[PDB]
Design an enzyme around this catalytic site. Structure first.
Site, PDB file in Angstrom:
ATOM      1  CE1 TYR A 100      -2.971  -3.253   0.630  1.00  0.00           C
ATOM      2  CE2 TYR A 100      -4.600  -1.437  -0.029  1.00  0.00           C
ATOM      3  CZ  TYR A 100      -4.115  -2.864   0.113  1.00  0.00           C
ATOM      4  OH  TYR A 100      -5.051  -3.573  -0.355  1.00  0.00           O
ATOM      5  CG  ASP A 146      -1.828 -12.157   0.837  1.00  0.00           C
ATOM      6  OD1 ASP A 146      -1.597 -12.024   2.235  1.00  0.00           O
ATOM      7  OD2 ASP A 146      -2.752 -11.600   0.323  1.00  0.00           O
ATOM      8  CB  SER A 147       2.437 -17.137  -1.237  1.00  0.00           C
ATOM      9  OG  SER A 147       3.604 -17.050  -1.729  1.00  0.00           O
ATOM     10  CB  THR A 156      -2.752 -23.276   4.089  1.00  0.00           C
ATOM     11  OG1 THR A 156      -1.783 -23.944   4.230  1.00  0.00           O
ATOM     12  CG2 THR A 156      -3.952 -23.685   5.058  1.00  0.00           C
ATOM     13  N   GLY A 190      -7.401 -12.950   3.371  1.00  0.00           N
ATOM     14  CA  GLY A 190      -8.039 -11.780   3.711  1.00  0.00           C
ATOM     15  C   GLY A 190      -9.201 -11.426   2.703  1.00  0.00           C
ATOM     16  CG  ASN A 191      -8.859  -7.198   1.280  1.00  0.00           C
ATOM     17  OD1 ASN A 191      -7.995  -7.707   2.019  1.00  0.00           O
ATOM     18  ND2 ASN A 191      -8.339  -6.245   0.709  1.00  0.00           N
ATOM     19  CE1 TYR A 192      -5.546  -6.911  -1.428  1.00  0.00           C
ATOM     20  CE2 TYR A 192      -4.905  -8.408   0.243  1.00  0.00           C
ATOM     21  CZ  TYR A 192      -5.117  -7.094  -0.200  1.00  0.00           C
ATOM     22  OH  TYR A 192      -4.523  -5.869   0.441  1.00  0.00           O
ATOM     23  CG  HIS A 212      -3.537  -1.614  -3.395  1.00  0.00           C
ATOM     24  ND1 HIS A 212      -4.559  -0.857  -3.564  1.00  0.00           N
ATOM     25  CD2 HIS A 212      -3.981  -2.969  -3.815  1.00  0.00           C
ATOM     26  CE1 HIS A 212      -5.583  -1.728  -3.876  1.00  0.00           C
ATOM     27  NE2 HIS A 212      -5.251  -2.770  -4.004  1.00  0.00           N
ATOM     28  CG  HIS A 243      -2.871  -6.758  -6.943  1.00  0.00           C
ATOM     29  ND1 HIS A 243      -3.221  -7.724  -6.100  1.00  0.00           N
ATOM     30  CD2 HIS A 243      -3.413  -5.575  -7.006  1.00  0.00           C
ATOM     31  CE1 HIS A 243      -4.386  -6.914  -5.415  1.00  0.00           C
ATOM     32  NE2 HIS A 243      -4.595  -5.689  -6.138  1.00  0.00           N
ATOM     33  CG  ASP A 259      14.694 -25.563 -12.889  1.00  0.00           C
ATOM     34  OD1 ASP A 259      15.391 -25.207 -13.644  1.00  0.00           O
ATOM     35  OD2 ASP A 259      14.823 -26.571 -12.246  1.00  0.00           O
ATOM     36  CG  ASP A 309      27.205 -15.414  -4.029  1.00  0.00           C
ATOM     37  OD1 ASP A 309      27.193 -14.518  -2.955  1.00  0.00           O
ATOM     38  OD2 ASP A 309      27.090 -16.558  -3.609  1.00  0.00           O
ATOM     39  CG  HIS A 334      -6.140  -1.657  -7.736  1.00  0.00           C
ATOM     40  ND1 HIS A 334      -7.020  -2.725  -7.062  1.00  0.00           N
ATOM     41  CD2 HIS A 334      -7.345  -0.790  -8.125  1.00  0.00           C
ATOM     42  CE1 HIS A 334      -8.471  -2.287  -7.326  1.00  0.00           C
ATOM     43  NE2 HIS A 334      -8.588  -1.203  -8.063  1.00  0.00           N
TER      44      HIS A 334
HETATM   45 CA   LIG Z   1      16.986 -24.936 -15.342  1.00  0.00          CA
HETATM   46 CU   LIG Z   2      -5.735  -3.976  -5.941  1.00  0.00          CU
END
Ligand SMILES: [Ca+2]
Ligand SMILES: [Cu+2]
Ligand SMILES: [Ca+2]
Ligand SMILES: [Ca+2]
Ligand SMILES: [Ca+2]
Ligand SMILES: [Cu+2]
Lengths: 720, 718
Positions: free
Chosen positions: B363, B377-378, B385, B458-460, B518, B520, B527, B664, B683
């Site tokens: 924000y 969030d993650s 979860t 939450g709210n998202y 805010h 996102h 990989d 490095d 946003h």
């Molecule tokens: Ca690779």
């Molecule tokens: Cu937003």
């Protein structure tokens, strides 16, 4: 009175599904979803029963139907998709009758010359204001229907205006210095001309071509280099690029490099032949039609609306949810979206008076003889509307589309019906919104989009334009590009070959001896948005990081620097996707005292690298002649005569007659009738995955309501 | 015999009755069934099935065998799912393995009473052993091992268990690491606020009558070097409160300028921050339609009557030329592994592993209740979860297959998420088309396989689509919906005295409500192993060069191509006008070009683009999360480096994510690289996003670049 159903239906363009288990036939065609059981004296049309006097008959494992089946069933009235317009819309395109009528008026004109051609025969726009009064108050227009007739008398352009109501010729006007666009007979002439040229024949035989009858030509605009090209601005010329037909159904894969012919269309002769180094024609068969491929089996997938569509098509007016709009066809630019309103709790709010392709350009970057002059203005110079490619049902459009037919005048002034000209289709576009509050019941709604899709193929290029009406008020404008690549014959087989480096200076080696020359695709959309009214202002909102002057541990803040864009020259700009550009109505606000607006997004993504501007030094001509290619955003005062970003007669144009001219005066854009012009394009650098045929690549643009509404537009009717 | 409708709708099957044809059409996932009352057979995905007991109509109600569903849906005719006899080494821990892992760490003399489990995940065998399994069917010949991260109060301890041998491999306390927010943290916060007389007092001041109606939110506090006046030592959460007015949307009634800091260890409020009293926005703003009536719609269905083109064997998805493994992680959600492209009978490696890297929602308000808002969030709340079970047909199209997924809860108990992931094939316009003038058209339809995942924190509400294009391109889209985090303000309209100050950091989207600006920012860890492990980063910059070849042209269109040799140089801003490739300098296509994948961090979006971090470089948020300001990153492959924000981002004092991974500046020349794509939005709110936000999307792309020798979709040569 009976016919084999399967053949008749296929021939009719209806999809026929037989269910052995259920002993049922499912027939689908546009808005009609039909169910019929052999022997049944009833058929189901869009969930409604329809009595059949003559049932479908299964004989010797073959279904049979009455000679009247298709008409009774398809045109039963149970399919309510299409309705009959009571009061003709002022913007309905000229009918085939009106086309013939307009041609007879100018033909009966004193100055009419035999062999005059019709570059364009179009409805002459009724007053914007009378048209909105018709659409919002259903107040009849009351000014005669007029037609604009633009003809080519050999190489000369004449402009006539016919009063159709009165069957009167209103004006006849020669247009000095203007060149006409390329007409279909030009294509045939070039090939004939090359075929009859002895020297040409000679140039091709010295280039290893044994059968000079196997040479395929392409008619190309030459542009304007201020005579630098050595071409008389006066002559009606076309450059000619040739390919060898090796029968793989792909001549584009067999270029005859460094061989250019200049044709004087007026003289019907080869006025110059440019010969460069001899490069052996790439001979390997490269069919793209699958003639040499194994066709893998995939499981059926169908999108069905068993009860009919959510939209209604009455004449050319489309009604869908809160959206109302008029849909017509133009021979040059194609589809035109007009009198676009948004039904806001019974009040129809103006969103766009008219929206359509403005024009486009495909400039190449190779300076060599067969390339330096390539900068196609396919709508302007070739007539994209005319070149519309009929929708291939289910592949080009999803299986639940409705395919419209459109009528235009051909270069001879004879009405022409384009079959499956435009696909209309509703689609599932993910969840409209969602909120899964913890330990609460989920809140989810599905998003629905109404897509208006049109395809136009010019030479090797195949263009797809989608006009996407989001149920929430947003409008998307997408453009996809596919077809076959314009390639250069080269000596390098691999990047390990000695000429590889020079061979690929201007494009990637996508096959043995084939280089996909770099070019760009630049599209410009002409959008006469009327945001909840005619009088609008251009406003900038730049999201900025400003120093925290309010206290606490924060060193910075996220603020917005907002300001109006007062006139046209300031409006003509590059678009920073990180910024916000609104078209607001300073005269009308939302519940929060916020001016009702639309956010303009010329750059909403793409699948090919983005075209940052025209990939031309500023000392270049193409660059000069056409200013539209460099700014992503333009705003101009509404002028009924300013419709093309490249100008009206771009063929061999010597100066900017398009957007450079329209804003040139730098007028005021304050509380006035604005026209938004959005420019977007790609920089196409090739790869082997795009040969022999190119995967559609897309660019997206968007128009979002901004404080236009007072709350989530999709929430629903209030019971309160 | 049971009522069919009940049994079926109870089973999650959709039932259609066609009175004209007297036919029941039953659908569930890959099962497309047609049955007629009294018929001795049914149809399952186009295949005939002998019925023991025909459907029985009674009172114009259908009745079926209590064996029906099993007999029919589990007949074998629905080949959507297949048995996995040799489990893939990346298969996620089973419920049994979760239970056994918990037993093993609980058996150690070191296990402390009340320890919570922040994460219990598979410790996969080695990358090469996994590729050998997927490609050569070489068994890993290894014991399942698990990583078990525990929270002993506020202390993080990392353990490793061996599931076969059922043994503790290691126990390692992590110095200075704060653990993520666990579910119980949420209730302790509310509880603790409820019991606070002082708190109740503050609320009282603010015009709140009933303190029982106060809804808290447990927020990470970040790290200000002590300027927030918070000790680094303490396990803290800040608390923002809303008033419940019974509209089902507490988010619409903020209690402005009242902040409480809670010490989850001391189980008490350690600080109350009070700013100016702003009457709570009281107007009821339900988003659940309690107050609305939707406009009627005609039905639309997407059917695949003969089943699907894909097969799911365990977690192995096979579709067209694509083969990949889909597994669930409690922190980041889905993992797309061992992705190969079957090039004419030869599987070519595309991606060893791809997932969400991490994400941030920061924000721009410097005020007491906003300045600290930087939601990871993650990393900090566990997005896997918090997965939101797909709302069948709304959240995903009617032709999707919804998968259930199992992870471990914070107490170490297995937890199965229903309709965790949606798998669906979709029509994506024409694949290619050429309408040669006067010739028969050449058109093919484009098909895409989408793997969709929704997580709500939450709210998202966050939507993630992993899109497999039949032509070899991989798309990754992120949709954003939910409820906006708003600020109570005194202005009702833009014509109010305070309107100007009120809107300094956000739009006025409702009377007395400001949608606080805010960002996102999404980061995907990819990989990519382009046709192999050893790759190189190559820049291809289109440029306008002066013409030296002659003729009338002044300029030419050329490319400035060159290698990006190390991590520091690979750490950069993305110009959508340029090309960035991950090439295999060891393999080339038929034209001698190195097989590559074009990396596109920014393929478009519907919200204004975040070009960087909408933060001054001296900002603490800025310091901690370097990933936020570069759109492209490439680092040497390291199994322990998986998060852009670092492993333990809560109250991090410095960058332990990408900032550290490239620190490095190692060489990226012909070595195993990992691509990280950062994409975002800025946003700025609208009235059209209140009370619920219309979904906004961002697009990213990975396209084959000279990987193939031609159009990958023409097919096999006759
Ligand atoms: Ca690779
Ligand atoms: Cu937003
Ligand atoms: Ca002007
Ligand atoms: Ca206007
Ligand atoms: Ca490193
Ligand atoms: Cu192109």
């Amino acid at each position: 009175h009976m016919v084999p159903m399967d053949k008749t239906l296929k021939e009719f363009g209806a999809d026929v599904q037989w269910d052995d288990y259920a002993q049922l036939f499912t027939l689908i065609k546009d808005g009609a979803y039909v169910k019929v059981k052999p022997g049944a004296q009833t058929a189901i049309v869009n969930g409604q029963p329809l009595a059949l006097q003559v049932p479908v008959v299964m004989k010797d494992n073959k279904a049979w139907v009455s000679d009247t089946f298709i008409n009774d069933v398809f045109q039963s009235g149970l399919d309510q998709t299409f309705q009959v317009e009571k009061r003709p819309h002022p913007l309905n395109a000229l009918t085939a009758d009106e086309i013939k009528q307009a041609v007879e008026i100018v033909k009966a004109s004193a100055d009419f010359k035999p062999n005059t051609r019709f570059t364009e025969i179009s409805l002459l726009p009724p007053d914007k204001e009378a048209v909105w009064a018709f659409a919002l108050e259903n107040k009849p227009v009351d000014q005669p229907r007029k037609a604009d007739v633009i003809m080519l008398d050999g190489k000369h352009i004449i402009e006539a205006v016919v009063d159709l109501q009165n069957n009167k010729l209103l004006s006849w006007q020669p247009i000095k210095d203007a060149h006409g666009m390329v007409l279909l007979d030009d294509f045939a002439s070039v090939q004939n001309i090359i075929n009859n040229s002895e020297e040409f024949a000679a140039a091709v035989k010295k280039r290893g071509i044994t059968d000079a009858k196997k040479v395929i030509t392409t008619p190309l605009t030459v542009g304007y280099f201020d005579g630098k090209d050595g071409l008389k601005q006066d002559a009606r010329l076309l450059k000619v690029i040739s390919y060898l037909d090796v029968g793989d159904g792909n001549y584009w894969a067999h270029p005859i490099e460094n061989l250019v012919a200049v044709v004087d269309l007026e003289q019907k002769k080869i006025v110059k032949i440019e010969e460069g180094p001899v490069v052996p024609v790439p001979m390997t068969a490269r069919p793209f039609d699958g003639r040499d491929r194994v066709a893998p089996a995939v499981k059926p997938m169908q999108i069905i609306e068993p009860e009919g569509k959510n939209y209604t098509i009455t004449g050319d007016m489309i009604h869908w949810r809160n959206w109302d709009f008029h849909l017509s066809m133009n021979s040059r630019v194609g589809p035109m979206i007009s009198t676009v309103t948004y039904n806001d709790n019974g009040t129809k709010r103006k969103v766009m008076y008219e929206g359509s392709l403005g024009g486009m350009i495909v400039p190449y970057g190779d300076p060599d003889i067969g390339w330096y002059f390539k900068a196609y203005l396919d709508s302007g110079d070739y007539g994209m509307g005319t070149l519309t490619s009929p929708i291939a049902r289910g592949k080009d459009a999803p299986s639940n589309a409705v395919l419209l037919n459109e009528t235009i005048a051909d270069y001879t002034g004879v009405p022409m019906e384009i079959p499956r000209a435009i696909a209309v289709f509703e689609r599932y576009a993910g969840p409209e919104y969602k909120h899964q509050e913890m330990g609460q019941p989920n809140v989810s709604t599905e998003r629905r989009e109404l897509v208006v899709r049109w395809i136009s193929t010019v030479g090797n290029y195949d263009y797809i334009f989608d006009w996407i009406f989001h149920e929430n008020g947003t409008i998307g404008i997408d453009a996809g590009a596919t077809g076959i690549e314009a390639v250069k014959g080269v000596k390098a087989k691999t990047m390990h070959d000695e000429t590889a480096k020079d061979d690929t200076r201007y494009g990637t080696l996508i096959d043995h001896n084939i280089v996909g020359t770099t070019h760009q695709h630049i599209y410009n959309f002409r959008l006469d948005l009327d945001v909840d009214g005619e009088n609008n202002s251009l406003v900038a909102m730049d999201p900025v990081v400003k120093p925290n002057t309010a206290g606490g541990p924060r060193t910075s803040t996220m603020q917005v620097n907002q300001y109006n864009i007062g006139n046209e020259q300031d409006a003509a700009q590059k678009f920073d996707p990180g910024t916000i550009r609104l078209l607001s109505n300073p005269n009308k606000e939302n519940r929060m005292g916020n001016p009702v607006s639309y956010q303009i997004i010329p750059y909403a993504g793409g699948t090919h690298p983005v075209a940052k501007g025209a990939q031309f030094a500023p000392d270049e001509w193409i660059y000069h002649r056409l200013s539209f290619m460099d700014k992503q955003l333009w705003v101009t005062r509404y002028h009924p005569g300013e419709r093309f970003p490249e100008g009206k007669y771009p063929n061999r144009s010597t100066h900017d007659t398009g957007l450079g001219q329209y804003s040139k005066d730098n007028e005021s854009l304050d509380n006035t009738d604005a026209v938004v012009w959005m420019t977007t394009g790609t920089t196409h650098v090739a790869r082997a995955e795009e040969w022999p045929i190119m995967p559609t690549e897309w660019v997206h643009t968007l128009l979002k309501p901004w404080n236009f509404f007072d709350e989530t537009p999709t929430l629903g009717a209030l019971k309160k």
